[PDB]
Amino acid sequence: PAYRILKPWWDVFTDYISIVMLMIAVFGGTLQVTQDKMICLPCKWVTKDSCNDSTGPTGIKYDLDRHQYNYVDAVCYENRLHWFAKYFPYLVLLHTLIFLACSNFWFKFPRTSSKLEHFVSILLKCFDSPWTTRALSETGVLDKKEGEQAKALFEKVKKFRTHVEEGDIVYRLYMRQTIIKVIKFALIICYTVYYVHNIKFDVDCTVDIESLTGYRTYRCAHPLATLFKILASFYISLVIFYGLICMYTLWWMLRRSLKKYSFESIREESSYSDIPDVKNDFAFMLHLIDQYDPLYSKRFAVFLSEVSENKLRQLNLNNEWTLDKLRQRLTKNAQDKLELHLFMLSGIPDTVFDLVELEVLKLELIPDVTIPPSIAQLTGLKELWLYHTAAKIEAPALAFLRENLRALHIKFTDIKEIPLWIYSLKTLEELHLTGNLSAENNRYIVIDGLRELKRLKVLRLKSNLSKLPQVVTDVGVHLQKLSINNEGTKLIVLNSLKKMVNLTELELIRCDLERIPHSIFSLHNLQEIDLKDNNLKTIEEIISFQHLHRLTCLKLWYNHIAYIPIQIGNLTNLERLYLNRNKIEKIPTQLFYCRKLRYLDLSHNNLTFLPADIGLLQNLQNLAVTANRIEALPPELFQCRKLRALHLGNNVLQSLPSRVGELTNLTQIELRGNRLECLPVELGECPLLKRSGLVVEEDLFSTLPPEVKERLWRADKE
Amino acid sequence: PAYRILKPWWDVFTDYISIVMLMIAVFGGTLQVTQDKMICLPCKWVTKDSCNDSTGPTGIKYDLDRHQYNYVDAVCYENRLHWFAKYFPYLVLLHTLIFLACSNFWFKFPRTSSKLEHFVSILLKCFDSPWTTRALSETGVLDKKEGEQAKALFEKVKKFRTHVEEGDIVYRLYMRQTIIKVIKFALIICYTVYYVHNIKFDVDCTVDIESLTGYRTYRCAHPLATLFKILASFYISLVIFYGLICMYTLWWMLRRSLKKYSFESIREESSYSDIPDVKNDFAFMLHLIDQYDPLYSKRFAVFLSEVSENKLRQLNLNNEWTLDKLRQRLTKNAQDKLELHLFMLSGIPDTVFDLVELEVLKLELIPDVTIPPSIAQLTGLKELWLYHTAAKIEAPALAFLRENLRALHIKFTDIKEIPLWIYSLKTLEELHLTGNLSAENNRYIVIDGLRELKRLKVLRLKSNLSKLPQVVTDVGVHLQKLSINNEGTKLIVLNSLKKMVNLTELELIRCDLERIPHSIFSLHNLQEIDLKDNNLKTIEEIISFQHLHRLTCLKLWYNHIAYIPIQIGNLTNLERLYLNRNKIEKIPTQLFYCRKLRYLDLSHNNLTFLPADIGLLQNLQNLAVTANRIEALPPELFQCRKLRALHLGNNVLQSLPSRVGELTNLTQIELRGNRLECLPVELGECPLLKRSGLVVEEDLFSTLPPEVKERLWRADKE
């Protein structure tokens, strides 16, 4: 059936003893009801209310009719026969019924019956699940339905365990009913042994009946006395055994503290040490199961272990993300390297470590992930991005990283979630800290270990830092690229950059400087300068940039500057100048003294006209003047032949010179938003020009001869 | 039901006998309770407390009313009727109940009830499993679910076997209850046969009742005496049969030692000889099953054989390692041919032999590997790798390998674990021994069979040779490439290389020569010679190498040479020369006389400067001068234009000569570890120059003008 596992050997022994006692009770009751007469005979001679018992023999004449004998039998039976001899079977029946009631009370009381049914259903479901079979076998691939069933079983087992530990009702009812059984056995044995000698075959009744029969005392015989006596002896022996069993049950329930379950055997033998001991009302059920069969408890033990749940989740992720299905999700970043980005995953699948070709791994919002040593299988992995991810490392994996790690990007909201092994990677070249290093008024101790990286070359601090850290200044002695994104927070250098003399990039995006630092003049090794959104008003510091012999990538876009300084003519080695999103009205001629410009870009600025000496800069390749008040392009703009990109959008350009055919290198040109009424007929005289190379509105697209349109459409096939 | 298989014929016979005895008990009980009266009559004439039994006949007047007769009947029934006549049905009921209880004890006792239920569940599952059907049919294609279920059933059967052999409980209870049955039958027969004569129709009761009736003795009649007597005879016959059955059960359990199961008939008939005998508490259940039906035991026996587990593993391997998986798992080795690597696999999947394009097979740590004839299905297979695997091959597959096998790789630690059929492979061309052939005071007898293979070209002995085996000396007269690696173990020749006349490769890696052997001079046909890690001291024997007019690949790295002899100039055929990892203070100029050097490399040498004569080596391709204290490079060296690779690591260099720019065939060059600070501009103009070709420090790369960097990186794509 179903509840056979919930009854220990003593319970079934008591059940069978109760059945035998019920048979005794019904046999005695049938005996009494069918015939329990008391055959009484008056005796002539009386010796203190007792019969004296003092040619051929002859019978004794009593002159009593049959009905008088029946009456004296009835009176002597009701009055002078001991109540035990008359009511033994009924007392046995009542005691057996009470024993059965107190044995089955917890099975029938709904408050505990529901809990028992829930526990047995859960135990049966957890006993036969193949996940338990696999876990016991281990002491590769499982079906999705099986994994989902195991996950649901884990969840409901945990919820049931949480719900049950506060009950403490099944154990209380079991203990109370066992106490009732023990005390009932004590009383039954005492009174039955005391009164069993009170039943006998021959009895004497002096019932005081003279006016109806004529004799006072009667010698009476009870035919069932011997049978009732042997039945009482049998019932006494049965109750003795029942009481011994109940005493054993009490001793078992009072010498173990059954509210606490050990659960140590499996966790010390199978090494499943992460199984906490259960509280009251659940240790009792497990003890009962142990008394029935320890294997059920052993198989149910796996569902309470965190290791089992964790490896179940890992197997679920392995099934969900196969190798072929995961190579599909591989993507390429801007740097053209294989990138695997995990988003909102429950963890790191172990199948991702089979991709030897993996090069970039990005982890974003995965909770409490431990990088398994299987990462040692990978070879080409160089970038690891942990955005809001706390990753814990193992010993072989940490050494593998310290040997073969190149890049690391981490974003964090609190310091406590940053890796504690980040400093152990002494070969990391580039680091990207986009968290919030401003702890509780600390001197950036959380990054004080940045000096450990002796091969650190790129820094990407974006943490709203109020000032450049001492540790950063120390580590910048061998730093190639320094990038600070202060998000508009005011930053003060205060003579802190001259320590670094090997920096090549000094990106200062949103540092809110408002002034070009005076220490940047000491970094003659700087080549790329970016000052986006620093609220810079005066940029006359170009008067000191000529000492920097490698200044070639001066970028000053997204700023508020009025007039370009003449000191630009001081510099000569400028290759990429960017001054977009500014308010500049006049373009100086001396700016063109830098004949090495390649990617000059002046777009979204309050410009008015293009100087006619731009042809003097024949090395120009790109020039984007989108969103500017440029009335017309001067012809000298087309003197250059090396120009490639030319973006003139949202500009008031009424006319376009026909000499566009002079430039063969003009690849992409953008003229959307301009006030053009007709297009040059030499626009098609460019061998290298595709559909994406021309960006104009359709309405004016047909004003040119259709032949060049057909040529362009023919060249746009592939 | 389910336990009918667990009850032999004696069990069901005893159950039916107990049913019949219970019918006797209830019939006798109903008889006694319904009417068990004893009709007594007083006798007037008495002879020693016994009735004497001494015109028309007339009745005898006793002057006793009916109630006096009832009283004397009751008294004579209780006192002078034998207890057996009154309590025969109740004793029969008690004995029947005890017999039933001791028969069903083990089924109802939970400790053995759970074990029996688990055993019968496992037996029923293993009886109808189609895996047993296949195994018995064998004395094709199997579903994945069926195979998984079969593996799980195998595992749980093994676990149950491990759990049960320590029990020894069910057998003990069965033996004890059979002993109880036998002794109870003995006592029942004794007392019942002794007291059956005590029941009789006519009885005499001298009950001493004079004050109530007036007669001393009474002749009484028991109406049920004859019915009870025939019932007792029937019950005695039934008990005799029951006792004989129990005696047979005891004899069956005491002449076979049921703790141990032979299990040898099936394992000797079906060739499943690998079925170990089961221990106690599990052999007993098998004996019971044999008593019921041997077919259940035979079908359950397959799960206890290692052979069935092995073939189930093989089938699961074939189902798992599908054709597509192995096809995708094929790799390209260094030799540019299809290769497949098997690591720690339990066997070779049969789907592997369906990859006709396979050419190289690698097996490592595969235990008890058997090559089926289906390897003849493979056609492109040419090399076999047997790493720590003992391969067993049949006649057709052996012929296929004798006809279509080129190379062989075997790894071992013992002599015996190598294949004994290796010498049967006539068309073998390459051999790879990586074991320990140094046996107990033998002249390498095991490899003595190498004389069988006259078609061999490559021999790769690696067994830490102390003396060259005579078999190798005799077989080297037709050998092409001989590579020997003793891992620093001493090697002696004593005129052992003179026998060979046509050898070309003489790799003597880590053979602890400590001196150049004098037997190598006779091998004028050698072309490649290497003496790495041979503890050499002086190499002035080059005068004896003038006989070798084909010596072009003499390698002497990883040695200890004080200086290069001046006899190198006598030779002129040097094309690949190596003296790496040595301590030589200067390179003599005569060594540069040989104009046809192409792969001269001198790395990790204590060299001071390179003579200008190195500029006459216009034919040199690769030159490695890493870890050399060369202060400057001669301009004459850069005059050549056929140089292909120049590696410079950890060298004393402050600047690079400016005439390298004239080089156009320079494919690659490295300057890592040097304290250089200036990179000449003319280095940026070269037809053969890419980012991979020139790898230098990041800081030093920024000193060159950037205009060529964009052009180079734009062509770095393809």
From Swiss-Prot, chains A, B:
Effect recorded for residue 30 to D: Abolishes activity in hypotonic solution
Show which residues constitute the signal peptide: none
Q: What is the effect of changing residue 66 to A?
A: No effect on anion channel activity. Impairs channel selectivity, so that the channel is also permeable to Na(+) ions
Where located? Cell membrane; Lysosome membrane
Q: Which residues are glycosylated?
A: 52
Alphabetized Pfam families for the sequence: LRR_14 (PF23598), LRR_8 (PF13855), Pannexin_like (PF12534)
Q: Give the site residues for Required for anion selectivity.
A: 66
Keywords from UniProt, A to Z, are: Acetylation, Cell membrane, Differentiation, Disulfide bond, Glycoprotein, Ion channel, Ion transport, Leucine-rich repeat, Lysosome, Membrane, Phosphoprotein, Repeat, Spermatogenesis, Transmembrane, Transmembrane helix, Transport
Does the entry annotate any disulfide bonds, and if so which pairs? 40-220, 43-51, 76-205
One of its GO biological process terms is:
spermatogenesis
SMART domains membership = LRR_SD22, LRR_TYP
Post-translational modification comment from the UniProt entry? N-glycosylated.
Tell me the superkingdom of the source: Eukaryota
What disease is linked with this protein in Swiss-Prot or TrEMBL?
Defects in Lrrc8a are the cause of ebouriffe (ebo), a spontaneous mutation that causes male sterility. Spermatozoa present in the epididymis display severe malformations, mostly of the tail. A drastic decrease of the spermatid population is observed, whereas spermatogonia and spermatocytes seem moderately affected. Defects are caused by decreased volume-regulated anion channel (VRAC) activity in germ cells. Oogenesis is not affected but embryos derived from ebo/ebo females show early developmental failure.
Q: What's the protein name?
A: Volume-regulated anion channel subunit LRRC8A
Q: What is the lineage of its organism?
A: Eukaryota, Metazoa, Chordata, Craniata, Vertebrata
